[PDB]
Design a protein around this ligand. Sequence first.
Ligand SMILES: Nc1nc2c(ncn2[C@@H]2O[C@H](COP(=O)(O)OP(=O)(O)OP(O)(O)=S)[C@@H](O)[C@H]2O)c(=O)[nH]1
Ligand SMILES: [Mg+2]
Lengths: 175, 469
Amino acid sequence: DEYDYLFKVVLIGDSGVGKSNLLSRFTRNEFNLESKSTIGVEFATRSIQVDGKTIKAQIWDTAGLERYRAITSAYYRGAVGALLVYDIAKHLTYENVERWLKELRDHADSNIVIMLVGNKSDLRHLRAVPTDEARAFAEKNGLSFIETSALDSTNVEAAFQTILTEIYRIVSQKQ
Amino acid sequence: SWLLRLFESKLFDISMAISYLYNSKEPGVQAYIGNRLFCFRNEDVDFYLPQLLNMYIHMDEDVGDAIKPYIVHRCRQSINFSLQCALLLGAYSSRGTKLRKLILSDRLAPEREFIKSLMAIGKRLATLPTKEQKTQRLISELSLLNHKLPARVWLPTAGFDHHVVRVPHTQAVVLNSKDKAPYLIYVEVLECENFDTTSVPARIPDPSAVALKEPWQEKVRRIREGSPYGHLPNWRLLSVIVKCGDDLRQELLAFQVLKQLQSIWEQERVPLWIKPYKILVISADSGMIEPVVNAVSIHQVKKQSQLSLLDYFLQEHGSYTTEAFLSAQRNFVQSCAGYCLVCYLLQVKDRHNGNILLDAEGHIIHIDFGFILSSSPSAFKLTTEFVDVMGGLDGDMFNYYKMLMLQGLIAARKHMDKVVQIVEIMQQGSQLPCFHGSSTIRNLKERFHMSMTEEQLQLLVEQMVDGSM
Ligand SMILES: Nc1nc2c(ncn2[C@@H]2O[C@H](COP(=O)(O)OP(=O)(O)OP(O)(O)=S)[C@@H](O)[C@H]2O)c(=O)[nH]1
Ligand SMILES: [Mg+2]
């Protein structure tokens, strides 16, 4: 039969933070160290089940580069979920998080669920962003927060199922 | 996922790590390896430090930024590592100037003043055209360094952390009568667990001070008995050759190749014998070399004893039927084959009896590995004398010598890339004469003959032996 819900979730963030690999690890449990730049958008999907209700998660990995930026702003439309991904080894990607927040609040819904993701946690010795600071920033702006690693699959499904169940909670409570 | 399966497999050592770091143009890979460097044992990465810093200096900033965190951390950990880094960065730059100055600025003052003092002393001996005059002024100059000791000063050519406390100036000697003459010195030090932890020892103020041509052990006993620090169980004696006017970079490369080939032959259970001596590059025109004890050049042997090498073997180790002569002959054969393979692979030129050393056991030890690979001033030869020592052309030991060469050659083939890598990475942006040709690496690769079978390698060894005579 039919799904109970079709959740639209977009992956946004600076180019190179590891969105495509987070997506590939969540949907196909695969990883590639030599992943090339995403051209426009990449589509993956996964059906989860929450509270007896079936929910198909349509996930769109958007391109971090400006080249396809406008095209990535058309996938903000109708999106109930958004993962703002940065790199813990590159501080600049953490700096642009606010900009991604602004753009997300410019081209998407105001009631969208935002999950702050700090990818590449396996690179312990290359860390440029402390967890406490990022958590503080996430809590200060009413965002979810989690540090992931697509390489060793740490907190990937945790992040996705977290934002998905949160979305389901928000949808159900408003009904 | 294959590559990730590889990087996390048991096959992933510092060698392959640096290989991929050198070849890959993927930022994720560079970052992964840059973080992975922290997971390797310090002594494993230390051997490849010159390659790493060379990559930092003469390659794109992605590689350099990938390597930089590890180098910074290690520099924060070890002051010796900081010194080595500053030296190698200075010597191989003609980018890392800022990093070098950052390392020097941090503490390193006593060490730099010490080294500069030694080099200054080395330079001041030019006004004396003789070995003995030079030696006299050397002892005089060194007699004025002990007043500045002890201090946060050490010899990087030692395999342990320590503080320099004394210098038996009377025991020092200049090695030749050339302009920038290298000089040998002995240094009394005190070994600690960690140099960065323990501070400097206190100072404590004509029987022993006579310089004789005695063995290393007797030198140690003599110097220690007359030393104010000698009663300490902490006390240990070191020895270094200071070269104030000698580029030792090619020597360092050759040292790495030697260590590698040694490791390979040990792994493949091939009884070849070589003796790599530590090299300390201080600049592009100066450095230090840890000498091999109880060993004198073949020339010095045939000059002091005035005998042929075989005669000297019969005088020093006994007649043909003695155990000592047989053992010494075995050592001679194995060392000869080993350094034959070394000279063939590295294309070592300027080979004479002034460069070939001889120790008490009967090993030969090639030194002064300048003019290798492409650079040429005269390669290694098999003189009648060496064959006479090995017992003749049709002898068992000569056949065993050739067979040792073949075995070591096959062993080298089975681990060729690990040797080629060392040279290939150092070639990057190098102004060294040993890279004068545009195809040094190609020729090096060709000298391994990977396309040949074992029979063809046998024929190759036969041709090589025939040609070297
Ligand atoms: N160590 C480690 N490396 C990662 C991780 N995730 C991604 N990478 C590496 O970072 C590089 C970039 O990852 P990638 O997934 O292509 O970023 P992206 O955000 O999708 O890039 P784009 O589509 O916005 S342009 C890749 O080479 C990948 O190997 C991770 O979790 N841990
Ligand atoms: Mg991508």
